[PDB]
Ligand binder design. Sequence first.
Ligand SMILES: CCn1nc(C)cc1C(=O)Nc1nc2cc(C(N)=O)cc(OC)c2n1C/C=C/Cn1c(NC(=O)c2cc(C)nn2CC)nc2cc(C(N)=O)cc(OCCCN3CCOCC3)c21
Ligand SMILES: CC1(C)C(=O)N(Cc2c(F)cccc2Cl)c2cc(C(=O)NCc3c(F)cc(F)cc3F)ccc21
Lengths: 63, 311
Amino acid sequence: IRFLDKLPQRVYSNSIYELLENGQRAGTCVLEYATPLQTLFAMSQYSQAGFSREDRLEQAKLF
Amino acid sequence: SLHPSIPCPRGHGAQKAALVLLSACLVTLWGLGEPPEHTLRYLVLHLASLQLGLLLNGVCSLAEELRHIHSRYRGSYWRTVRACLGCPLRRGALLLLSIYFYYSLPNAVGPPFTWMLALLGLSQALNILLGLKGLAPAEISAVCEKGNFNVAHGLAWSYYIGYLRLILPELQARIRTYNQHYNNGAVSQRLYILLPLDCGVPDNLSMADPNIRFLDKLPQRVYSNSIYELLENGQRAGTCVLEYATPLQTLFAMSQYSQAGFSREDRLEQAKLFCRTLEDILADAPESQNNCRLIAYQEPFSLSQEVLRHL
Ligand SMILES: CCn1nc(C)cc1C(=O)Nc1nc2cc(C(N)=O)cc(OC)c2n1C/C=C/Cn1c(NC(=O)c2cc(C)nn2CC)nc2cc(C(N)=O)cc(OCCCN3CCOCC3)c21
Ligand SMILES: CC1(C)C(=O)N(Cc2c(F)cccc2Cl)c2cc(C(=O)NCc3c(F)cc(F)cc3F)ccc21
């Protein structure tokens, strides 16, 4: 998965990524992560959450 | 040398022609072999008459320039005399030479002193009233350009001082930042200024030629510069920051109105002169460190091909 180009355009920048299959680009797509999962992880890191790793995985699946 | 139609700065052809004429006249005089002292007398008398006529014309000009002294010559008569008759001491010496030569050298073909003065005054009055001593447009343009008395020079310098010098130092950094943001192609780092000799500046650049198409607003008082990519046989081959020359648009608007006294041929002359003046300024300016180029053209053809060949 390698970055190719910032998709042209309230200002959303979606980096597109090409997919190397044995070194050859089988295609490309607009690919991105899910930020609520990152917020769940950061919730689990902090101590003012009461939100453990077991609960973090449970909430990730439920989300 | 931007365009085949842009005039070159005036050469020394007039002085070359004068030297050719002087050589021919010397050949003729040596062939005829007339008494040289008579020739000296005649030439000195002719120059004296011409100088005194110029003195009379300057006096006539001073007669009206005396009323502008408070607002144009800071209320000093010496400034008015200098502006109406050139350098005072040089012309006074020439006039004294004329008077002494005429009063010493007899005039074989010429009036006495009072008769010559009266005839010269009459001729000066006739030339003033009838406009016989008329200024040819070629010499008018030569003098205006030599002394920088053209609207195009002022417009070009205003365009430089107000806009170009402010944005060129940071245009390189802005283009580098944009190219780092949008990668893959890349955008040329040099500004491109359009210069249609016909002064046709459409609001939309793509309307003039579909091959040139807007790409993105370049990131940044507030300078909104639009970048354009050029279509070659349906596919883009290059891209650059391309904007129109607003002073040419102002020149066209000046030509549109009926109070500027600014005709279409005058608009063509000032367009060419603006192109040349901006060429010189951006050639010697420090801010134009190979940073700006002018696409000067005229439709009698595609602009995009010319911009590509520039790229
Ligand atoms: C001066 C150089 N020059 N000589 C000739 C001939 C043509 C130009 C030229 O092209 N100049 C120019 N073009 C710009 C384009 C952009 C952009 N965003 O793309 C940004 C710029 O800088 C802000 C631009 N500048 C410089 C500043 C320009 C205009 N302006 C002036 N008038 C002059 O300076 C002036 C002096 C003489 C003589 N003639 N003129 C103008 C005809 N007073 C201003 C006061 C304010 C304020 N603080 O309130 C804001 C200003 O600018 C906002 C206008 C932006 N409009 C401009 C037109 O198009 C659309 C965007 C002011
Ligand atoms: C170059 C050459 C040979 C020449 O072609 N002329 C024209 C000309 C005349 F004008 C007059 C007669 C014969 C010729 Cl031939 C000329 C004139 C003088 C001269 O002293 N002119 C006095 C003078 C005027 F005559 C009229 C005037 F309004 C003011 C003035 F001061 C000297 C040399 C020449």
